[PDB]
């Protein structure tokens, strides 16, 4: 599956970084699971995960730094409370969970740059 | 979340092993995802996954050895084509996916014992 997202995004002084994550849905999917994987220092870190039902708003799995809202066949993710050390490649994994068949999409990733104020 | 399932189940000569997996649903959940995790030799193996929907019959994710039918707030799982080497602890992970909030349940696990005929 094809998954497109911004190549680079700058985090604000507060430490908030928003980025879109659109996917070319082949079938008429109802359930979609968007998962944010942070890749840095040759290790993967599952930042957050959310389930998007087509006719309803995006819901994130319990407590995470991620917020956002869905719109058709794309999601506007918003990562909060970022610092300098969090700077890495934020890969956007999409999965069409229901109905069958199962489709997997992994984007190139959004390199979110962060710096600490004073 | 509380998830109950048989402690031990014996697989038939053909290699079929059925077991129930009931869960104490706190809220009025419509979508529920039952996942069979086989734990053996200090490693987890995702055997299969089924999405219970309100208005539909239990639907397994693409092709698996698992079949079964839902009945209210429980599922009767049926694992087929098992052999001696498959013998392990079949843990039954339940997730209330929709509507919010998200609930996770993981049972103690059903130790399925299997024997090869001659």
């Amino acid at each position, epitope marked *: 599956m094809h998954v497109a997202q911004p190549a680079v995004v700058l985090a604000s002084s507060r430490g908030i970084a928003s980025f879109v994550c659109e996917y070319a849905s082949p079938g008429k999917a109802t359930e979609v699971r968007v998962t944010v994987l942070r890749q840095a220092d040759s290790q993967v*870190t599952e*930042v957050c995960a959310a389930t998007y039902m087509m006719g309803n708003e995006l819901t994130f799995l319990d*407590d995470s730094i991620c917020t956002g809202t869905s719109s058709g066949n794309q999601v506007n993710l918003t990562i909060q409370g970022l610092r300098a050390m969090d700077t890495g490649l934020y890969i956007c994994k999409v999965e069409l969970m229901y109905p069958p068949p199962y489709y997997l999409g992994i984007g190139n990733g959004t390199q979110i740059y962060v710096i600490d104020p004073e | 979340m509380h998830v109950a399932q048989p402690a031990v189940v014996l697989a038939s000569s053909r290699g079929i092993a059925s077991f129930v997996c009931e869960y104490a649903s706190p809220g009025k959940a419509t979508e529920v995802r039952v996942t069979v995790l086989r734990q053996a030799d200090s490693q987890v193996t995702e055997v299969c996954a089924a999405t219970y929907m309100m208005g539909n019959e239990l639907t397994f994710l693409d092709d698996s050895i698992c079949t079964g039918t839902s009945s209210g707030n429980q599922v009767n799982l049926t694992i087929q084509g098992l052999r001696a080497m498959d013998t392990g602890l079949y843990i039954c992970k339940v997730e209330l996916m929709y509507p919010p909030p998200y609930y996770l349940g*993981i049972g103690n696990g059903t130790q399925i014992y299997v024997i090869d005929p001659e």
Partner: nanobody, 125 residues
Framework: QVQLQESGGGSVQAGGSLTLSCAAS????????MGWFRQAPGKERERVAA????????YYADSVKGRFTISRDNGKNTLFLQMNSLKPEDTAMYYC???????????????????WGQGTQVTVS
């Protein structure tokens, strides 16, 4: 494998203060959610607090909201629970937990934590 060991627990007077430590060891990925759970005599383990594996993100129970604080040292080796304004209801067996290595986001149910510490008792008069 990851191994957690608690310390700094004990009995104190009501309206007092304590600081629980949980020295975490043997991490492949140190960007993992850690949390604190307490178990009263008979009742099940409820989550008091939990911190995100990535960035600053603390999450608390309403029962201890404002009075308790969860924090991590620079190296992410030791997890702390700053306990202030201790009430008799806070009396329980406190456990420090960790999510599966790599899982930054924090489960509310204790079923979503793989690694646990032996536990430490906290009594409040």
């Amino acid at each position: 494998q990851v191994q957690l060991q608690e310390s700094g627990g004990g009995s104190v007077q009501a309206g007092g203060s304590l600081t629980l430590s949980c020295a975490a060891s043997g991490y492949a990925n140190s960007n993992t959610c850690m949390g604190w759970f307490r178990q009263a005599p008979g009742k099940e383990r409820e989550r008091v607090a939990a911190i995100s594996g990535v960035g600053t993100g603390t999450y608390y129970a309403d029962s201890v909201k404002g009075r308790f604080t969860i924090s991590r040292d620079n190296g992410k080796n030791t997890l702390f629970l700053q306990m202030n304004s201790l009430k008799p209801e806070d009396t329980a067996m406190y456990y420090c937990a960790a999510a599966p290595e790599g899982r930054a986001w924090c489960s509310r149910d204790p079923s979503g934590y793989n690694y646990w510490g032996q536990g430490t008792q906290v009594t409040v008069s």
